[PDB]
Amino acid sequence: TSIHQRLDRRLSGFSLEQPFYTSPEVYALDLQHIFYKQWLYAVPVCQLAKAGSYTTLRVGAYEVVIVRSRDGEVRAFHNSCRHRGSLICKARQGQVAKLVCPYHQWTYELDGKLIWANDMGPDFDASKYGLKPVNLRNLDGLIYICLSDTPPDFQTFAQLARPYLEVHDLKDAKVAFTSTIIEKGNWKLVWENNRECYHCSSNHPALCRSFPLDPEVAGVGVSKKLQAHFDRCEAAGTPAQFVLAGDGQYRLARMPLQEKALSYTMDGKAAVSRHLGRVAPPDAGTLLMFHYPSTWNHFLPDHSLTFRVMPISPTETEVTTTWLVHKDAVEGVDYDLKRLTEVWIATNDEDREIVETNQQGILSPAYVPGPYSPGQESGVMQFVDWYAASLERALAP
Amino acid sequence: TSIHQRLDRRLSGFSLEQPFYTSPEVYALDLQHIFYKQWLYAVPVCQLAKAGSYTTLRVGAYEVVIVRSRDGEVRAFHNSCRHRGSLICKARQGQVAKLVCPYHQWTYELDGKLIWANDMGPDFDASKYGLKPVNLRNLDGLIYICLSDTPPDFQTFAQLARPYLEVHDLKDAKVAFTSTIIEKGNWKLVWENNRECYHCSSNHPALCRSFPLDPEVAGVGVSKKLQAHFDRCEAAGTPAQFVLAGDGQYRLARMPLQEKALSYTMDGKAAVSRHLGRVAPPDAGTLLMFHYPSTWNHFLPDHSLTFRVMPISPTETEVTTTWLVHKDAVEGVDYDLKRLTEVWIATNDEDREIVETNQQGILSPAYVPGPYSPGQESGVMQFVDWYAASLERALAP
Amino acid sequence: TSIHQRLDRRLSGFSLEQPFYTSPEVYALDLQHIFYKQWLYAVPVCQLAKAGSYTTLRVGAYEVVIVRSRDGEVRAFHNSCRHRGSLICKARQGQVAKLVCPYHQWTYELDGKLIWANDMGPDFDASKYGLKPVNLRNLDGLIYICLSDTPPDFQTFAQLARPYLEVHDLKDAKVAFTSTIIEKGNWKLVWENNRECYHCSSNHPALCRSFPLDPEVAGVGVSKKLQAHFDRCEAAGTPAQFVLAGDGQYRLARMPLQEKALSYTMDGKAAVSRHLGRVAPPDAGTLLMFHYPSTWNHFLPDHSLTFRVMPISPTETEVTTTWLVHKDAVEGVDYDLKRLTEVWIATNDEDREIVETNQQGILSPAYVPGPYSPGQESGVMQFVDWYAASLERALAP
Ligand code: PRO
Ligand code: PRO
Ligand code: PRO
Ligand code: FES
Ligand code: FES
Ligand code: FES
């Protein structure tokens, strides 16, 4: 059975056939046609605040380095030397004056131009051997990249998202904490888990203290109560109402938290006393933003959280959670690290356990597609539809 | 060279060509056509004595759960939730009231029927979404399963084995100890090792104190001495003489132990003072039973041992040894755990070393089939013939 | 794109396309057509000085045992028993009277003849079941093997090398130390690294104290200064001038060390006070010998170092470094182990880091061939040309 035959018979109401989650064949297609073609969230721009600052990441098999250039522009490159291919930057982050290959010291400017290569002979043309650029955009303080030479339209998303994101002043953030975990499930299982709260009541004690179980929230006609919330926010100058992409790739909405909760903490109170941004009112709740295939995000009045989803193998996925706070917020004074991070550290661990257990069952040859809950899993169906449509379009002529 | 060409040129007197032991291709065929098609030993029924008791196991890629239902019947199911596929039972063993999926709490009765699924809509038909059954038989206190929807005949074996097994009263056993090891060799190498004692004199000091080296015993015209033993047993009402399957799949015989030994212990005396069963006389020896591809067994007058062979990868096999004693036998009083288990713990470790060393040599491209000993390895040839015949029949039309 | 199409478009001046370094497909071809076909360095003959002495090694998937036979000849065999295939010698080295299989004790003479096999029946012909020989040569105290039944010409190399190697009296050596490391890069990356010192100034502080950076040395018209060195050696009876194989497989030359250095030590002085061989004058420097694909070597006046390169996987290579000293040199008296070994232990660790970092960059799909330095990497181009030519010839008719 070919991939085309499986896609042909797929019904929207059901989980995917086994090979979509387990096969090296589909994994290769997901990299080739999804991760290597779409815009992806990389890191917050505040990680590149300093002169000569760089950060590195892997995307599938690609090695990327993002750097703050002399002119203050942030640029991304393939972290592969044009001589014999070596990584140039080995550390996760650092600062340099130039990009100097550790092997034979070919030396590049922070805009990628090759400025020195030792003893290469008279016929060497350094202009042919600069670092290969990676397409890059700045979404209001969040850096996105695209590995394709012909990137899709990012501007439609950027323009829609700006009014929602600008009130968070993310350019003025710092990273308070980063957590990187490997979940032993296919990247699609990580997404299907994220896009519903059908599992939340039984699995997430800590999160449920602040995050509502209502399908309207975690998932996808606006209820009167929800509309009232949007109106409180927007009367105060804080954009809140739904935005959903035409093709389903992204969504934004600012949702209410549980009864009286203001933040993702065990006591429901703000984690940080010096807020990141100018969000009002104080109970504006959580700005939810997803953008497939790389990221979901929760921006609160006091701090923000970004999540980055990267594929590792057919049955492994890396999830990176970053806590953003105001750059002038002081650990031990304006926030406590445990208080700030404990809810989502626990939640992520619970999701990982669930995803791994789901993956273990799916590996049985007895596993067959089952029906999603229309009421509780509309967001899961929405994701699976986006994925299948994306794959179909990429495989077409 | 195709699998069919290799099977075509195979001669009975020789070990198999390399790919049978090392190739992912043959490993996939062995799962598809052998392990996924034949009856397999799972666990003793005494593991499921209690109300709501369950046990889990993996067979190749299948995840199975065996449960004692309300009506007292033991049943097996695919341990994959009909919603999104999750394992339902994660522990090796336990007790439940219902089978409740840890993900979104779909809840099944112990007969597999789906009795509650939250918010699935008006068009949801729970009768289509019960757990998928796994075929199951009870061989006189030992649970066997078959992953095929069209299982082979088990009744012929069951009827032949009953008179031999019933005298052991296995329904009245408890598990005194279980040992699970991974041997780094193909499952067929584990079997070829088991089916001869050509290696025993040099490799098994402890076992040789009680287990005879005679090829007649470990392996396949009955000698006068052996016939005399069968007659002592059968005069006392204990079935002992050879039973061999028409197609070679299974064999039973009650064999004498070494000079004066009564059990598999370092001193040769019974391990347990309260015997499991009604075997007579006290020196009735060891009831040997194999059933390919999953199990060999030694049932003694005082206790019994079951062995389960499960494939892990082309060059890895899991062997599970279970010691059964009378349910009323008390550790520290009627038996000592070290005394009961030390002989076969050592023996299994020695076999593992031998199998791994054999596998290491076989991985050389210089390895070629060699001749089995007609006198010392007739049982190995018998196994290899059963395997090749089974594969041929499965590949045919 | 087929292997043939990649080979067709290859230009000499450039590093190889990705799959040559990363693909399982090319790895299989490199084993089949290079490692399994050419002469390979195994071990120094002094490891087999004693009666009944043996040593074992793996080459790709082959398991080899080399043994000193009763008649004093050194012979090699496939370390796979002719019965059911088991390794016979499990230890890295040892002494035996006979080669006795640990499984069922088939017993072979040290010339490989099967002299005892238990209970094999009347129709068993032991003359058909001796150990399979491996072709073997002794290069003046260094043992080389070839896994092909039709080995290439070794004599041309042997005759050229003898005058250079005989002055080292390697038959009179002992092994002072052996270091075995795994480098996480393709075997070709290990070679490309070895065949240039373009990386040395920045990466090898310790080695640079004694080993010149001059491209003439580490790499490939002889300079006046170098000729003067050759002449000092040869006037003293020590062969030194270049020898390069017609087909590029091997090279020998005795090169000067840095200003006043005599040996590879932190202080530049001889590591061992009792010299291995009769090399003169004392500042004769380092005899460099490579022989693709298995070995590079440095023979100094006081001690010698051999290096053996063996493939482990597409992105892993085992490098074994052996320090040879005079058999009568006493550790703690004539040499200090740290002083003798520290320079190359550090150097090998630095090379490993470089190779692994190079491999990591090459794994990016953005990696493309880049140009080698004509002045600094002529030896790298020479190796890559030898490799590609070897592969082309093996794939031809
Ligand atoms: O491992 C390294 O050195 C860089 C960091 C991100 C992945 N590649
Ligand atoms: O790992 C688990 O949770 C179950 C137990 C047997 C194999 N699958
Ligand atoms: O592992 C062993 O026992 C032998 C030693 C070299 C490789 N094979
Ligand atoms: S690989 Fe970067 S300078 Fe050589
Ligand atoms: S996967 Fe079992 S209830 Fe959802
Ligand atoms: S495998 Fe060597 S004697 Fe049997």
Ligand SMILES: [Fe+3]
């Ligand atoms: Fe969750």
Ligand SMILES: [Fe+3]
């Ligand atoms: Fe054994």
Ligand SMILES: [Fe+3]
């Ligand atoms: Fe080096």
